[PDB]
Amino acid sequence: HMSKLEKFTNCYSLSKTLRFKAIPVGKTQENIDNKRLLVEDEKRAEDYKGVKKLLDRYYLSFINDVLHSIKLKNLNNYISLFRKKTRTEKENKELENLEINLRKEIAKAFKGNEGYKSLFKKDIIETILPEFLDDKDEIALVNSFNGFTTAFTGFFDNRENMFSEEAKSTSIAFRCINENLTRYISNMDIFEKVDAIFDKHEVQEIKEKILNSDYDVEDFFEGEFFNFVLTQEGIDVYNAIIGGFVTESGEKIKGLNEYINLYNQKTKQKLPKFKPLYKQVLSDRESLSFYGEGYTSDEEVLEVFRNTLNKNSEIFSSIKKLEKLFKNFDEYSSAGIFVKNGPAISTISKDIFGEWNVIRDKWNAEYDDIHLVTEKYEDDRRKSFKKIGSFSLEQLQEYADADLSVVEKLKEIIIQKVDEIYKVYGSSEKLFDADFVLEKSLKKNDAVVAIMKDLLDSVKSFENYIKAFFGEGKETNRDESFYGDFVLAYDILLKVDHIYDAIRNYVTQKPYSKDKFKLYFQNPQFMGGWDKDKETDYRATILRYGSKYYLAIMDKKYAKCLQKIDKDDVNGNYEKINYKLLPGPNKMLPKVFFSKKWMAYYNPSEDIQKIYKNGTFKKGDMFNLNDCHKLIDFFKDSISRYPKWSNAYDFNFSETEKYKDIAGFYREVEEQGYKVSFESASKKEVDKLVEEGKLYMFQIYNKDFSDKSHGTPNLHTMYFKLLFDENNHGQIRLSGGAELFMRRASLKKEELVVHPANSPIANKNPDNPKKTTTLSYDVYKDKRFSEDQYELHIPIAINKCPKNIFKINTEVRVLLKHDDNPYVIGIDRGERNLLYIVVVDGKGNIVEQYSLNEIINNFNGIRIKTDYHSLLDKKEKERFEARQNWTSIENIKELKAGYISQVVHKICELVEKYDAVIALEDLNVKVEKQVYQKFEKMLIDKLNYMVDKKSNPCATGGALKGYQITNKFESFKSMSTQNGFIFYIPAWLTSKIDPSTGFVNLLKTKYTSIADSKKFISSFDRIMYVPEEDLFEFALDYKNFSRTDADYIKKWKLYSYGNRIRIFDWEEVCLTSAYKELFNKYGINYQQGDIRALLCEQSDKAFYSSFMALMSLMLQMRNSITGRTDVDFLISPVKNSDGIFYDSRNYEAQENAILPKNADANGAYNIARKVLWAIGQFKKAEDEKLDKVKIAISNKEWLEYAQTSV
RNA sequence: AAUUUCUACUAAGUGUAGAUGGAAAUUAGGUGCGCUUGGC
DNA sequence: GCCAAGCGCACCTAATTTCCTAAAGGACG
DNA sequence: CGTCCTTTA
Ligand SMILES: [Mg+2]
Ligand SMILES: [Mg+2]
Ligand code: NA
Ligand code: NA
Ligand code: NA
Questions:
Q1: DSSP tag of A515
Q2: Which of A217, A232, A288, A1157 has the fewest CB atoms inside 10 Å of its own CB, making it the most exposed?
Q3: Do residues A231 and A304 both lie within one domain?
Q4: Nucleotide showing the shortest C1' distance to residue A120 CA
């Protein structure tokens, strides 16, 4: 037979972009320089972005006029049905209609206005925007695009999107109804649960400062009020209710979420918080919070820094004022110096005793002396402690051990902090002195920011320690000889708060960086397309000479200069492209044949018009197959009379009777409405056109076109050549919409790292036995960015006319059903491994297993191993430390992309080698360490058109016949748990499971009560010591425990076998010995057969807490250390059918292993097996019902699968 | 350490291997730090 | 030491939309 | 009436 892969070619179409360098040839550059086309094009890009901004001012005005005047009708019905918890399938459809009607309501409000049509035509530039604007300069900018408004076509599409009624991400209607109305209704539910919590005063504060006293806070949680929140102005008010704002004085006014969090933290509860609404499309309103003016120049920051933080500055004297205050502590009453309860006490507690909570513990101990252990008790103790407003230093002294003195320690600390400020000055006298001027800009001067930040840091650290000694403020007996002075020095120390923020907010800006700009050559529709009839209008074509391809651009004054070039019958010739496209027959045939021009020459019958004007062919409620054939016949005869087409594409249509619908005919026109060929044109004469500057010529270039290129080309190079290859029968088409850019040089060449000619360069690969390379030319780092570069972007279309049309998912289920031995590739996001791969066959035998932390490659017999796990971790640390240091933050997305491109390649190779399907975790780690989402996207992308560059283009899986084994990637939003060959399955207990028996830990073993522990110990069939094995044995029937019904075997004998890694820091624990130590601590005769009743007689709560913890470690099969690839073992407390305990460390040691080599490998293995279970589920089902099989294995089903396979 | 671009390279000497859907628009997320009020 | 709710500033990242056109139509000299 | 920009399906 064939493979399953073989059936997945020519399934659906997609577009890609091929990118190239464009290299000016001959006098092209000089002529561009003389005519000044690049300064023209660079300025146009600046002005173009300016007109878009002005256009947006109008659109936002138009959006607000409409939205401010809209009352949504379907509103109460929608909200009522949206909540109702017993929605039948009828009611779900009903709710869907009201959601549509609400979006239609908004969209019609926009599209209703007069001249809504005019918003996306030249009228808005030439007329409407000039009237709306006032500034004579802004007007002149808009007016400079008269005769160039075609250049805004795409921007106008971007703007129309905003007014779509569709449930689409860029639509205002979508943002109002699908997102903000959904969040608003969710908040109404939250408001009814949470309402009891807010006191009258808190509610009135928001009403007064947030609402202006014009509404009640309850208003914004009633349905009828949603209209208020359709505009940004309203959203901002709503979100202030939720989140509060910062006043002009800096006071943080609290919103509802703050009050919910405080209530939760006060009462140990978990009330839900409100979701804020998203922004309205195209708005930009000021924050309702006040933030002070920030510095703006390298000069001003240096001024503020030297002014306010020099030794003569006041801030400095307050520090010494405060050090003298503490140094003479004994001249002040320690009964009158107060540390406010809260974070100040936490700080002083750590500073003096080593931990934040020591003072609370000493206070709790004294409370216990009077009142002493219920939860009632601890909660009363907490409430009594939280009532205390502050602690005196004298009181603090009574908590100190006999040897420690509290007031001496405070002196010692403040001494240590002022010293550290001096240490930092010792490196900063240079930045301060009058002579100093700076070399590089602060945003790029690392050495000067580190001086500033280290001094700023040392002052902040002193400030926060000082703040602890303020107290509550209103204590009665507080020493004012200390506090009058303290408050004076502290209040000027606070000056550093605005300085610190303002300096940080400036110095951490990335410096500006210019972007490339589009070139138009004075054509508002430049290079829009390649049809020969349009060459004059677009003024751009493609030429070929030998292996080399060229972009040819006709100067505006010489639009016809190329057409006039005949073939040279003797000398050399360029091959000029001859390109014909009939684009989109479903729009192009109506367009011309029902036009004023054509209906003149050739009148359709009144019947044809009526069939078309009413849509009797569209395959809808009014579909009429006889009418569809009559219309097709009119197009056909119109086509024979339209020479521009019938001559270009000698059409060959099926007889009309054979068409089932109008698309059946349109697909024939579309498949034949495309031809590419070459004519000859005199090289001498074409080159003279470039000489005289009537033609501009660029070589279409990447490194594979170099005469020194001799290896496998890039895939994209192959795509580009195949566009013009005779063996390409339409699988890859050249598309319109090409664009040309100028990217100005961004590096200076004399500042690039150079490896000089004739001097040996070190090779970096340690496996490369050739330690050195010596070249006869210079090699420059990032050379390409040290010159101006043209780049050409060329869209292409792949499988424009697909023929293998079927539901991809269904075909996969059908092929698997009838496959004797299907291979699954299990892929797991592990703890110690970015990705882990295990391949299984149809019977679940492991065929390959390895980590993808490192990528292996081999070329010319040379191995290269790239440790990407290490590279990414290095990069994450550089980014983390740069954020904390105010230094440059390096990119990581390219490194993840480069890593994942290697992963994807390896998986495509596994898919092709083993004809295999792919099993993934159905996600429904820490964000910067994450890699899996990018890996999904790039893998799905590749499987939309999967090519092996090594294959012949025309072979299955070659560049003309790519495999399409995932559905066309529209969005993550629209994905199910199957995307062709990729199955997403529940990850539940795929890693934390014994692969050799299926045993899983279903016990709750976190310590709770002494009687709970008794119950837990009593539920085991027996506990005993096994002397012949030196093991403790725990016989259990799962049916005697809560939360158990998922397990299938039920009866297990757990043994204290082996070691475990305890985490808390980490330490190795030997179970049997730890048990023995525990029982011996308490005089338990653990040899006394069944020790169960003996264990329950213990009364010390510390026995049971220690016992439950040992039980936990025993059921902890997964044992790993953070930062250790090599300590990730899986060990079972259960014996298999032959008396053996599964230890992954047995398998990690062997080259090929029957069972998982570690816990992350175990995850990939069982993810794969959950898909094997689903393949077995397709087999039980009949073909016509295959797309109804639930591929998600239930928990109980998995425990039975995993415990029975073995 | 060269690139349409990216990642790893030097790969036998102006490059090697793999990947690469671009443009525009909208919007969201995350990290870090400061401040406010709180919890452990 | 860690953390929550909220505000602010700086930075980097990424999801989801649209187009990937020749020819009719017309404003303009 | 030719050319160049805009609008259409
Ligand atoms: Mg190559
Ligand atoms: Mg590099
Ligand atoms: Na796309
Ligand atoms: Na944001
Ligand atoms: Na943040």
A1: P
A2: A288
A3: no
A4: D7
Q: Which amino acid is at A595?
A: S
Domain boundary among A248, A267, A286: A267
A151 and A50 assigned to the same domain: yes
Which range of residues forms the domain containing residue A470?
A: 298-507
User: How does DSSP classify residue A457?
Assistant: H
Give the pairing type, strands A982-985 and A917-921: parallel
Q: How far is CA A672 from CA A580, A585, A652, A759, in A?
A: 10, 10, 8, 59
**Which pair of tokens denotes residue A245?**
């704002």
Angstrom distance (rounded) from CA A75 to CA A80: 9
Residues A64, A96: one domain?
yes
Flag whether A724 is in a domain. Answer: no
Question: Is A16 part of any domain?
Answer: no
Indicate the pairing of strand A917-921 with strand A695-701.
unpaired
Q: How far is CA A1087 from the centre of its chain?
A: 58
Contacts of A234 (CB under 8 A, 6+ apart): A228
Last residue of a domain, one of A655, A680, A704: A655
CA of A929 to the centre of ligand 3 (A): 26
Ligand 2 centre to CA of A281 (Å) is: 39
Q: How many CA within 13 A on the CB side of residue A128?
A: 21
Domain shared by A224 and A346, yes or no = no
Q: Which residues, at least 6 apart from A342, have a Cβ–Cβ distance to it below 8 Å?
A: none
DSSP state of A724: T
Q: Which residues contact A1 (CB under 8 A, 6 or more apart)?
A: none
Distance (angstroms) between ligand 3 centre and the Cα of A168 equals 15
CB A1068 within 8 A of CB A1092: no
Please identify which of the residues A921, A936, A994, A1128 carries the catalytic annotation: A921
Same-domain pairing of A496 and A369: yes
Residues facing residue A825 across a β-bridge: A839, A918
Question: Catalytic site residue A1160?
Answer: yes
Name the experimental technique: X-ray
Q: Tell me the CA–C1' distance in angstroms for A469 and C5.
A: 26
Q: How many domains does chain A have?
A: 5
| DSSP code at position A135 | -
Nearest residue for C21, CA–C1': A583
Kindly give, in sequence order, each residue whose CB lies less than 8 Å from that of residue A1170, ignoring residues fewer than 6 positions away. A919, A985, A986, A990, A1193, A1198, A1201
Question: In b/e form, how buried is each residue of A795-821, taking b as 16+ CB within 10 angstroms?
Answer: ebbbbbbbeeeeebbebbbbbbbebee
User: Do A151 and A51 share a structural domain?
Assistant: yes
Q: Find the radius of gyration of the CA atoms of chain A.
A: 38
Q: Of the listed A323, A555, A828, A915, which one is catalytic?
A: A828
* Residue at token pair 């909660």: A379
**Chain B bases closer than 7 angstroms to a protein Cβ:** 1-40
Q: What is the helix (H) or strand (E) element at residue A761, kind and residue range?
A: strand A761-762
| H or E stretch at A597 | helix A596-601
Q: Is A6 a catalytic residue?
A: no
| Burial of residue A88, with CB atoms counted within 10 A of its CB: 0-12 exposed, 13-18 middle, 19 or more buried | exposed
Residue A503 and residue A389 in one domain: yes
What are the angstrom distances between the C-alpha of A428 and each of A47, A300, A424, A788, A981? 45, 18, 7, 41, 62
A450-477 per-residue burial string, b: 16 or more CB within 10 A, e: under 16: ebbbbbbebbeebbebbebbbbbeebee
A604/A594 Cα distance (integer angstroms): 8
DSSP A227: G
A764 is catalytic: yes
- Does the residue A328 lie in any domain? yes
CA distance A1068 to A1059: 7
Amino acid at A749: K
Q: Cα of A16 to ligand 3 centre, how many Å?
A: 8
| Domain assignment present for A400 | yes
Whether A149 and A53 share a structural domain: yes
